[PDB]
Design a protein around this ligand. Sequence first.
Ligand code: CLA
Ligand SMILES: CC(C)=CCC/C(C)=C/CC/C(C)=C/CC/C(C)=C/CC/C(C)=C/CC/C(C)=C/CC/C(C)=C/CC/C(C)=C/CC/C(C)=C/CC1=CC(=O)C(C)=C(C)C1=O
Ligand SMILES: CCCCCCCCCCCCCCCC(=O)OC[C@H](CO[C@@H]1O[C@H](CS(=O)(=O)O)[C@@H](O)[C@H](O)[C@H]1O)OC(=O)CCCCCCCCCCCCCCC
Ligand SMILES: CCCCCCCCCCCCCCCC(=O)OC[C@H](COP(=O)(O)OC[C@@H](O)CO)OC(=O)CCCCCCCCCCCCCCC
Ligand SMILES: CCCCCCCCCCCCCCCC(=O)OC[C@H](COP(=O)(O)OC[C@@H](O)CO)OC(=O)CCCCCCCCCCCCCCC
Ligand code: HEC
Ligand SMILES: CCCCCCCCCCCCO[C@@H]1O[C@H](CO)[C@@H](O[C@H]2O[C@H](CO)[C@@H](O)[C@H](O)[C@H]2O)[C@H](O)[C@H]1O
Ligand SMILES: CCCCCCCS[C@@H]1O[C@H](CO)[C@@H](O)[C@H](O)[C@H]1O
Ligand SMILES: CCCCCCCS[C@@H]1O[C@H](CO)[C@@H](O)[C@H](O)[C@H]1O
Ligand code: OEX
Ligand SMILES: [Ca+2]
Ligand SMILES: [Ca+2]
Ligand SMILES: [Cl-]
Ligand SMILES: [Cl-]
Lengths: 30, 243, 137, 334, 37, 36, 151, 33, 34, 49, 97, 101, 97
Amino acid sequence: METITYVFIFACIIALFFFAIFFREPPRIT
Amino acid sequence: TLTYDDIVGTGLANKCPTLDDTARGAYPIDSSQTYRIARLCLQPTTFLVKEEPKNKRQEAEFVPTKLVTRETTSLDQIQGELKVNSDGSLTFVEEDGIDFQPVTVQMAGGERIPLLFTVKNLVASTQPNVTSITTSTDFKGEFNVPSYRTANFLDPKGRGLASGYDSAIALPQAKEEELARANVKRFSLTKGQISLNVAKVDGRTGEIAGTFESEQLSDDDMGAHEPHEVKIQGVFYASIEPA
Amino acid sequence: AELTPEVLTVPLNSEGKTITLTEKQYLEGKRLFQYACASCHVGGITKTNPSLDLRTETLALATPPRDNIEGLVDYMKNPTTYDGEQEIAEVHPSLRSADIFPKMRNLTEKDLVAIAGHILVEPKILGDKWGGGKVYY
Amino acid sequence: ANLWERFCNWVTSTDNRLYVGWFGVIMIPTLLAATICFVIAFIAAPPVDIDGIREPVSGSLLYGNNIITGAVVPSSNAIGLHFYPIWEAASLDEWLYNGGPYQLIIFHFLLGASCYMGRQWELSYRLGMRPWICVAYSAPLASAFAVFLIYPIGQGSFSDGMPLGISGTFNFMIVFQAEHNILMHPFHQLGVAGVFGGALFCAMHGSLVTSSLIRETTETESANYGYKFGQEEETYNIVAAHGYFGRLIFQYASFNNSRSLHFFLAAWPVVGVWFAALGISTMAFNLNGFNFNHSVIDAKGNVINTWADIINRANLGMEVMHERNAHNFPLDLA
Amino acid sequence: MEPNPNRQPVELNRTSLYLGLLLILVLALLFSSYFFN
Amino acid sequence: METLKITVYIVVTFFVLLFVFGFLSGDPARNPKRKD
Amino acid sequence: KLGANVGSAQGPTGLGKYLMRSPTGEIIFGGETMRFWDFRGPWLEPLRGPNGLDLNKIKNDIQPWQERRAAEYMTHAPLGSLNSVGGVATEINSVNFVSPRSWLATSHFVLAFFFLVGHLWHAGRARAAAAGFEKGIDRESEPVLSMPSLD
Amino acid sequence: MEVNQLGLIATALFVLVPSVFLIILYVQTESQQ
Amino acid sequence: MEVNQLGLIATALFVLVPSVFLIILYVQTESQQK
Amino acid sequence: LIYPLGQSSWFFAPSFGVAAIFRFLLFFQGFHNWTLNPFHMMGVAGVLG
Amino acid sequence: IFGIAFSNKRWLHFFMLFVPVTGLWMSAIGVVGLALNLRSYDFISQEIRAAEDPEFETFYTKNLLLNEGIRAWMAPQDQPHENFVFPEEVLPRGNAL
Amino acid sequence: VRRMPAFFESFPVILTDKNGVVKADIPFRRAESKYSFEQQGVTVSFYGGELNGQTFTDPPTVKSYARKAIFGEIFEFDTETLNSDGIFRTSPRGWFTFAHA
Amino acid sequence: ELVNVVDEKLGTAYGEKIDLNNTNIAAFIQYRGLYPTLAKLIVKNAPYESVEDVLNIPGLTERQKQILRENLEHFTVTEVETALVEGGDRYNNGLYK
Ligand code: CLA
Ligand SMILES: CC(C)=CCC/C(C)=C/CC/C(C)=C/CC/C(C)=C/CC/C(C)=C/CC/C(C)=C/CC/C(C)=C/CC/C(C)=C/CC/C(C)=C/CC1=CC(=O)C(C)=C(C)C1=O
Ligand SMILES: CCCCCCCCCCCCCCCC(=O)OC[C@H](CO[C@@H]1O[C@H](CS(=O)(=O)O)[C@@H](O)[C@H](O)[C@H]1O)OC(=O)CCCCCCCCCCCCCCC
Ligand SMILES: CCCCCCCCCCCCCCCC(=O)OC[C@H](COP(=O)(O)OC[C@@H](O)CO)OC(=O)CCCCCCCCCCCCCCC
Ligand SMILES: CCCCCCCCCCCCCCCC(=O)OC[C@H](COP(=O)(O)OC[C@@H](O)CO)OC(=O)CCCCCCCCCCCCCCC
Ligand code: HEC
Ligand SMILES: CCCCCCCCCCCCO[C@@H]1O[C@H](CO)[C@@H](O[C@H]2O[C@H](CO)[C@@H](O)[C@H](O)[C@H]2O)[C@H](O)[C@H]1O
Ligand SMILES: CCCCCCCS[C@@H]1O[C@H](CO)[C@@H](O)[C@H](O)[C@H]1O
Ligand SMILES: CCCCCCCS[C@@H]1O[C@H](CO)[C@@H](O)[C@H](O)[C@H]1O
Ligand code: OEX
Ligand SMILES: [Ca+2]
Ligand SMILES: [Ca+2]
Ligand SMILES: [Cl-]
Ligand SMILES: [Cl-]
């Protein structure tokens, strides 16, 4: 159970990196 | 005829010397002379470990294992007296040499089995009436297997036999009876058995070679757990000389 | 506390004749001990053989006794094992082996007396620290 | 256009979401290999005989670690500086016992990070920027080289490289103090002034700019909406910022040249961290911290301890305990 | 990217929130004994 | 292990050749300003 | 010399206390120095044979010059402090020693490192200057403003 | 009582996961024009 | 490993409660008339 | 202030000096295992960050 | 280069304040615990396993041995008011050193 | 028995006579031990409490009580009811102080 | 069944005198004339059924036997303990200063 927990949190962080980079709010000059 | 630099890093330094297929002669034993083994070498080619099945009934078998400690396993530069006995048998009495190697092997599924592969204090004798050592000669003997770790060795919590803590200091108010086997270190000393089957003899040089099989217990981690039974098979080399 | 004539008075021989070293003598001894000896005997231990130290009680039980100037000077000319049985100049710095231990080449009798005097005075100052090793640092 | 020319155009393209580039061609596969092996080893690797004494140390989660205690453990002391790729092992089991993952990880990581630094040069050139961001990154890069490569080289073993784990890092630090008295080394002292100073100037600069933002928003809005990405005008009043800081200390202690200011922010932590890296890299060849042990002596010759001597007592504890089964002879000489 | 014309807003009115929370909380009250067993 | 060794050697050589021929392919001219 | 049989002496870990095997089988010295078995020097090679260190030569053939050299080299290991106190970091003051090898390796690492940084600094600058943007971005002609958005 | 030790986490997520799904949907409905 | 039997629920709620708070806020910001 | 006030006396506060401060670090390693502390680790992240 | 970038200069500068300021504040909270010896000294699961299993070792158990060395070797000179006398034979030490 | 100060997670076992002179200890390295309970014939006798009037001479037993004496007076504990792990915790005095500081 | 055999040994004459059958060789330095020459012979020729059998080592000189007699009062013998004599430990037991 602990190992699952640590790996789960880690996996979520990598998922977050993907969305933060590729699905970022795009920078727009206005 | 090779130098260190020819050999360094090839793996050849862990191999015992061999004899040509033509070495099927006979090395005369002069009952009047004194003799020595000036060099005994033992090179394991297989480590087998006896499985421990759940019900004693069904004989447990020795199964093959994977060596994880590399080419560091051979015994060599071993010497000692080669006695001629009343009945013409010979008795090798090991005096000294590189007569032990720690070895770790791994069972199918990953369990590691450290052992002190050794012939320490070997006394091994042939059949009676060995007027000449030939490819019919055999040696059968017993040897001692001291604890894999020696008395100073400290566990990862600092506990030891001749040094170290004598309790689980990280559990200051734990009851101590349940940790006695881990807390009180013990030093094993057991017997192993070996047979050396002579397959080649150079009657001129006094060199012999063959195969061996030894049986001995593995590491018990200074009494923490039960040891396993190990069978080591390999090849050997010995050079005999008038002493 | 001071480095007094009293502190500086040490056995010259086994009969209990003493010599009072001068301060210059003490300081020359320290300096020469560093020059010739401290690479193995820093602080009174012996790095290449930790079983034998330079504590005065240890020197006293050496054969011949080494707990005096003359014993130490003799050691520096012709060193022996602790029981006196083997001469060890081939592997230990001495006047007799100055050919192979060149830092011994220019040492005078007065220099050896000085090194000997340092060895006997240091424990009177440092106590169990002298020959004690890292436990006493 | 040629097939090769189209590919070169794509590799060096300014319009890829992540820049690739020629350094990128080496960086991408090496970092991916290091990362994949790191994650699998941190989860599932069996214990590793780091000190070559058949005493294997468990680093992985599945073998009883948590995030804090887990590590990819350094390769065996028996290996030393020998190159130990997977194919030099008889089996993966042997490779795992002996700490093969650590070598594969560190060597790919150091190559991939060196190429990261080149890539920062490369993109700056493609974009018409000035070229020295890569020079600032050379400070942490040099420090990673110091702990994973230069230190092992000096000491003769990758078993003495920094472990890839949180508690293992602390182990490395404590043993280093015992063996080098690094706290007493002026390059580590410069490192500290670099990172404490870096943090102080970071907070300072942030607070000074934030203090002087021009009012562009109402009370119910985040002030951050008062700046639009790419606007021409500066978003704060540097004269007001300077007027505050100049009076806080005295006028001449304050920067009103933003270029000098930003140069200083770069240079202070970068130079300090170069010196930290050079501390580890020269303690690698055992030129160690200042040793004032028994430096102070009274009229008689009694040692009068100083705080240096108390440090020495703590260092002794670390020294005598570390790798408690590894030393047979009285001096730890590497 | 050109906008996707298939996108639609989603809604959950307050009554639906309350009905839904009641379903979940009562299901939990019913199943929790079996989960603890 | 031999097959693994050859595979990695091929892989590494492939990428290293990309890097070298890549940077030989008119790299100074791949900037937004002066191209000679 | 005291009587130890050095070839058969098992140390605390199970490995030989004085002598063990390298990973390819050569006989080498034991303890932490197992990492240094590639070392070769004239005081030691007389003890080495085709198998590595030769137990017979060790037993019978070590000369006093070899003993002297080993003692000298053990006690001049290249460890010492910045103020030239020779020995491990916990050593007391007494011996004024830092090996020339430590001096020369440390100095040249430091110099070689700053020279890599000088390389990057000047190589980057020479590219920027040859291309005409080493003084900054042309406001009237900012290259990124003419590139498509990343997203 | 010797209950199943996963009972607590099973119960807690059984409640929280769908409750929070609903809350998310409700709140963004309220915030629509 | 004999870990604390509340460590799982504590970690889960530690993650879930604040993450859900942020998700609620983000989605209702997106759904506001743009 | 707080730290020595929880301990036996001011003796255990940091002394004001370079080596004295290094001693204080090493005391905290040996007695408090302070590097294991997640509050220290967040401090590290802030300073290095 | 890195996948993300600042786009808002005000946020950039506020974050420069936030990061080191928050870090120092967290370190202070830890020290307030240490005032009471309320340490993160141990992981209990590690110690239960290690006590029962003398082949289990991690970097965490390795560091505790170093700490035990530090306390025994440093305490007599560092805490003179305790008048500690630790006979040579009680000092924790590994082999040889 | 020399008592454990609060600072120490672990502490050696050292016994001194009434003038503070060391008379016995539990050695870590044994090869140069001079003060072992075995060399010094240390025994323990209890007065008051459950063990009143009892005397122990078996050195492992005497050493076990000496390890307890570093904590002060010696108690019998039920470690089963709560599956107690043997590692000290603070009281509400400690928790209150921490949270409020 | 679980006793530490080294601590037990400390409760025998091994804890009081030099045990000719078990004690590490450096102990012979405590008395005049025993180290290294007689020390080596004594360890090499162990075990001894009684202390006085030490006088019978082959090849001792007449002066050696006399030095031995002078030091019998500092010697003992106890049963050989495997833990103390394996590993070459009588010649180097991992302790230096
Ligand atoms: C990666 C390495 C690393 C890093 C980056 C840090 C970072 C930090 N450590 Mg940790 N430490 C480490 C490794 C590290 N540590 C290790 C391995 C140990 C062994 C356990 C420790 C032991 C340790 C201890 C024991 C302490 C820290 C503390 C700290 C914090 C100090 C913050 C500060 O600036 O105080 C500097 C002081 C201040 C900011 C106070 C105000 C200073 C005023 C403004 C000075 C004014 C001076 C004035 C102008 C006059 C100057 C005169 C001049 C002549 C000198 C910071 C989070 C401290 C902490 O947590 O504090 C809560 C602390 O007590 N560390
Ligand atoms: C009871 C009685 C007697 C009462 C009497 C009281 C009384 C009236 C006294 C008056 C008499 C009197 C004045 C006596 C003086 C006594 C005295 C000397 C007291 C001691 C005071 C003392 C030691 C003060 C310490 C001062 C000190 C250390 C100041 C800091 C200096 C320092 C190291 C600064 C860092 C160096 C430096 C160049 C930093 C710049 C980096 C930085 C912050 C960048 C960020 C930044 C900067 C900008 O600039 C702007 C723009 C922006 C954007 C920005 O990011
Ligand atoms: C024994 C005696 C011999 C001593 C010799 C010692 C040798 C050491 C070499 C030191 C001399 C080098 C000086 C270079 C100056 C410089 O950088 O100019 C570049 C700019 C120009 O200044 C700017 O000057 C500008 C004009 S111009 O560029 O100079 O033309 C002007 O526009 C601007 O307003 C003004 O701020 O300087 C600045 O930006 C001012 C910042 C303050 C100093 C920054 C440099 C050092 C920081 C690193 C410290 C690291 C150590 C800490 C470790 C943690
Ligand atoms: C593995 C990962 C899994 C993650 C999945 C998590 C998501 C699960 C969400 C499911 C919850 C949905 C509940 C919707 C609740 C809800 O929205 O109801 C009201 C809703 C009315 O919908 P309308 O068509 O009126 O549309 C209004 C819209 O605003 C709704 O979006 O009707 C239904 O959804 C029909 C079916 C449910 C009818 C349930 C009523 C139950 C009555 C009370 C029962 C308990 C008491 C019993 C006493 C004995
Ligand atoms: C070749 C590719 C190499 C790198 C690839 C992977 C890099 C991943 C980068 C971080 C992505 C996540 C960002 C989320 C957050 C996010 O999307 O930020 C995006 C945000 C955008 O900034 P703006 O200025 O545009 O923000 C506008 C503000 O006004 C909003 O109010 O960037 C920052 O705030 C920069 C500072 C945060 C930097 C955090 C760095 C984190 C490093 C990693 C730490 C965790 C390690 C755990 C390991 C287990
Ligand atoms: C290392 C190479 C050494 C140097 C330099 C010096 N000595 Fe030494 N010393 C060394 C060893 C290995 C031994 C033991 C030798 C043996 O087999 O017995 C010694 C011994 C001594 C002694 C005897 C100590 C005792 O308790 O009996 C003395 C008095 C002594 N050494 C003095 C001495 C002096 C004065 C030196 C400098 C001139 C010196 N030694 C250098 C190793 C080394
Ligand atoms: C741990 C358990 C977690 C469960 C998590 C569940 C995730 C729930 C995701 C629901 C997302 C709803 O998605 C959201 O829909 C709304 C409308 O409803 C969209 O909103 C769009 O339409 C609305 C309404 O006409 C306009 O005012 C708005 O300007 C427009 O953007 C949002 O742009 C979108 O972000
Ligand atoms: C993506 C999967 C990679 C992880 C593979 C883990 C190694 S394989 C793993 O090894 C263990 C010990 O050898 C065995 O006990 C176990 O049964 C086996 O599944
Ligand atoms: C039978 C053991 C030998 C006698 C010495 C026991 C010390 S006293 C002993 O201490 C324990 C903690 O270790 C308590 O849990 C227990 O209640 C108590 O009986
Ligand atoms: O391996 Mn890691 O650590 Ca560098 O010192 Mn030597 O070796 Mn080991 O001991 Mn101390
Ligand atoms: Ca046959
Ligand atoms: Ca229990
Ligand atoms: Cl360690
Ligand atoms: Cl060693």
